[PDB]
Amino acid sequence: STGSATTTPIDSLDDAYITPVQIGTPAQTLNLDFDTGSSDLWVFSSETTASEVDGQTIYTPSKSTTAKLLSGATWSISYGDGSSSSGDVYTDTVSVGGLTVTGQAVESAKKVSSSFTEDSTIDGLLGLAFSTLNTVSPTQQKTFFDNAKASLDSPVFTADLGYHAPGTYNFGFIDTTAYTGSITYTAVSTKQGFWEWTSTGYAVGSGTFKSTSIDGIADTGTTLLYLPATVVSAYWAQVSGAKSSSSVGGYVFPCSATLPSFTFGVGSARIVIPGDYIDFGPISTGSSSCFGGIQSSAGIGINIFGDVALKAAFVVFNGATTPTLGFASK
């Protein structure tokens, strides 16, 4: 089997991407944030505290003939950005782009933090990291991909995120028309439960490539590119007037700037992030200070190849017995 679903930016900045997901019988379609940095499929629901719902579409398990309470199971998750959610668990039928999993754990939120409430466009998350990170207790549950894997034509999914435009998540096949050149594969460590890999270096604009190992995670659920302070300083030093602002919470730059590109290495291959992908616009409405899309990972504890990086590539998440990651230009 295979599946193919379009993923759409939630706003004009590509802050996140939503993908429609069919849950239950008859189908209830919710727009979920596919997150390769976590491993829970959770949704706004009829059980979510009413004051914490503001415009989201909810899953109502009592209206699904295939929903079953997973008795005694609870979940609770905290994300790197400080947001969180928790609740109980149902199993139900879940389909993405024509690919169906029966008995998928659907984690129903009883509580969500303010960031989730305030984002009316995201109805929940669909985790695509390794199932070892799943938070369901006392019986850990499998991700949608893990459940689907054996049925897939090939044990892979691909992320093809757009810049200010829709893109695609495919399951079970590699669309050879969706990228240019060849795909370069690189080793993955699953030791922390992430799609963790080592970039071979970077360049800023038309500058020389610096060969240096940068360990980090491929994370579709993180907006920006978070890299070591040395690398980030080298980038922003090429933008007149750019500075790190503790009050704003990272590097800012004059909105009048033309940003240089940023290149990262994948083995001997190179992925180029155009300068425009690094512009996250005014820090507040009307401001001439703009927020940068490359930020320091210092104090996160891990480097994160978030959407800024991933949307410059066609990315293969290869879930074979020994997982690997592939990157191609597009």
From Swiss-Prot:
Disulfide bonds: 255-290
Chain ranges of the Peptidase A1 domain: 17-328
Superkingdom field: Eukaryota
Enzyme's top EC category: hydrolase
Enzyme Commission number: 3.4.23.22
Presence of keyword Protease: yes
GO molecular function: aspartic-type endopeptidase activity
Active site as annotated: 35, 199
Keyword tags: Aspartyl protease, Disulfide bond, Hydrolase, Protease, Signal, Zymogen
GO biological process: proteolysis
Keyword Hydrolase: yes
Catalysed reactions, as listed in the record: Hydrolysis of proteins with specificity similar to that of pepsin A, prefers hydrophobic residues at P1 and P1', but does not cleave 14-Ala-|-Leu-15 in the B chain of insulin or Z-Glu-Tyr. Clots milk
The family this protein is said to belong to: Belongs to the peptidase A1 family.
Protein known as: Endothiapepsin
Protein's gene: EAPA
